[PDB]
Amino acid sequence: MFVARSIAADHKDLIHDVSFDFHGRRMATCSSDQSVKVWDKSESGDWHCTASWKTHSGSVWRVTWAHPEFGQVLASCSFDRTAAVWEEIVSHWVKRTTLVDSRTSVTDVKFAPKHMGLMLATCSADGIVRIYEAPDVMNLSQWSLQHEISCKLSCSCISWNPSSSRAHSPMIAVGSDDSSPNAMAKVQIFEYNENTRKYAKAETLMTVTDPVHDIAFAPNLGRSFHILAIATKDVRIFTLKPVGPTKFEIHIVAQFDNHNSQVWRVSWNITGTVLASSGDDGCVRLWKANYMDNWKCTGILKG
């Protein structure tokens, strides 16, 4: 049902990460020479360039956007133990802050859902997950550190819980990529406690006992549960149902093997019904649900 096309965009190096904005008119890409580019669309449909600048000391893994009610804000995380925040002044992006609390390489950075303010969580390779806030939305040079979480493993990916209902407390999930020859669980979920004002472990997926390269949540849209997606040697989909931290009834609904390799990335769409996956065979596959609530492949695209 899907058809592929090439996009006219000149790059000189290899791309590490791609990201979009809320409306889908800008994008940011980071390359091998430590450069970030911001691409703008047009009425005709072509893409043009607007900025280009070298950022960090070491290699740059990630770049992410922010909600437009806060301005034009970008966040990047790199190998030299820092994460940075960029803002647009009109057009030359400037630096605002540099988070240096880490002692090893930062692997992932993510902005928080809107209704909690302007918040940002990073994660490192020593087993620490940290959370920052900005109490003034018109002063992005002043940030604060609020929580620390010790995971006793090597973090490799994080994801927030998009749900904004009044009955869901804030949630976060952390994966691990350690290859230690043992049988420890490699995905745990942390939940906020409104009474003690701390974060506490709530569940631990004990069936995932293999290396994990990516996790992702899916938008609520008013459902009764949560949908989670994992990226290990196979693609799996879990569900959590609500029933001291709350209790869940974790099920499983999907376990696919059609890559014969290690899948690297998983990403959902705005409604939360279609899934994308990228494996080490150079193909991108899309999955959907069916009438019988059974997940079946939809399309196969070769890069």
> 68 vs 135, which CB is nearer to other proteins?
68
Question: How many angstroms separate the CA atoms of 156 and 154, rounded?
Answer: 7
Cβ partners under 8 Å of residue 142, min gap 6? 97, 134, 135, 136
Residues 147-176 that bind other proteins (CB under 8 A): 165-167
If one asks whether residue 184 binds other proteins (CB under 8 A), the answer comes out as: no
Closer to other proteins by CB, 95 or 296: give it: 296
| 3-state SS, residue 46 | coil
Site string for other proteins, 220-259 (x = CB under 8 A): xxxxxx----------------------------------
Indicate the SS3 state at residue 116.
helix
Q: Is 116 one of the binding residues for other proteins (CB under 8 A)? A: no
Q: How far is the CB of 283 from other proteins (least distance, A)?
A: 9
Using the rule CB under 8 A, is 34 a contact of other proteins? no
Instruction: Looking at residues 259 to 288 of the shown chain, list those that interact with other proteins (rule: CB under 8 A).
Output: 260-262, 264-274, 276, 278, 280-282, 284, 286, 288
Question: Is position 182 an interface residue for other proteins (rule: CB under 8 A)?
Answer: no
Supply angle C-alpha 142, 147, 151, rounded to 5: 135
List, in order, residues 6 or more apart from 173 with CB less than 8 Å away: 158, 159, 161, 187, 188, 189, 190, 215, 217, 228
Q: Detail the DSSP E strand segments found in 58-195.
A: 60-64, 73-78, 83-89, 92-99, 106-111, 119-124, 128-133, 144-150, 155-160, 171-176, 187-193
Q: Which stretch binds other proteins (CB under 8 A): 2-10, 145-153, 182-190, 195-203?
A: 2-10
With contacts defined by CB under 8 A, how many residues of the chain interact with other proteins? Answer: 59
CA distance 198 to 149: 10
User: Contact positions toward other proteins, by CB under 8 A?
Assistant: 1-7, 9, 11-20, 22-24, 27, 29, 105, 165-167, 220-225, 260-262, 264-274, 276, 278, 280-282, 284, 286, 288, 293, 299, 301, 303
